[PDB]
């Protein structure tokens, strides 16, 4: 029902709503996959209610009652997602040896930079994909000068930062 988008009617207008603590990753690691599945939707309904409260508080130009509830619920859902992701990652490592769920490759783009190209799903092979073959995964020799120039720009930034750090340290030593 739509009443689940709002807090308990007794709490409407209360300046403060007492709430427990956010689920922790370790606490969630003890729960079953089914238990995590159900807790995900419990937390999702709570999150929807809290977002509704936040938006209505903005609309009414009033402070949100106990805004830390939203932070707690977001942290709990993040922890649940991390726990499920850990379990899936461990299973994937065990059964395939792949440290990453999505296929990809290190490729050099048209600008000479090394990127992690994440693969996409296609129905036809790459040598037939017309749009894919327009994309260039190589850098022609005119990019080498710009690669050197970018490297030297990075080097200048790093040298400035390190010199500034050393000078600040010397100033602190002189002060104290």
């Amino acid at each position: 029902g739509l009443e689940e988008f709002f807090d308990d009617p007794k709490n409407w207008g209360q300046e403060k709503v007492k709430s427990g603590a956010a689920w922790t990753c370790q606490q969630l690691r003890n729960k079953s996959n089914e238990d995590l599945h159900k807790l995900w939707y419990v937390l999702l309904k709570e999150r929807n209610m809290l977002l509704t409260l936040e938006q209505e508080a903005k609309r009414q130009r009033l402070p949100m009652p106990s805004p830390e509830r939203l932070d707690k619920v977001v942290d709990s859902m993040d922890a649940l997602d991390k726990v499920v992701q850990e379990r899936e990652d461990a299973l994937r490592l065990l059964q395939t040896g792949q440290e990453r769920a999505r296929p990809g490759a290190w490729r050099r783009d048209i600008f000479g930079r090394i990127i992690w190209h994440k693969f996409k799903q296609w129905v036809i092979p790459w040598h037939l994909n017309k749009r894919y073959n327009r994309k260039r995964f190589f850098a022609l020799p005119y990019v080498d000068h710009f690669l050197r120039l970018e490297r030297e720009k990075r080097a200048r930034i790093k040298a400035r930062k390190e010199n500034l750090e050393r000078k600040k340290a010397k100033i602190l030593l002189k002060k104290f």
């Binding site: 490592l93 395939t96 040896g97």
Partner: protein
Amino acid sequence: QDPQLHPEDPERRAAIYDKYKEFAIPEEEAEWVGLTLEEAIEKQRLLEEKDPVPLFKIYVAELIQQLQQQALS
């Protein structure tokens, strides 16, 4: 010494190989003759590309080895 040179004529094949004997080099070196740097990089990447072994196999081998050591000791 590929037998595909004039198959069904081993004497002719051996004659050709003897004629050009002095240039023979190990196959591990002949595989890389005349390769550009990019071709060589691609060849090496193909040589050393291996789908990762599932950690299941590694952990099973390690556990069996550890159990063998425990049984022996």
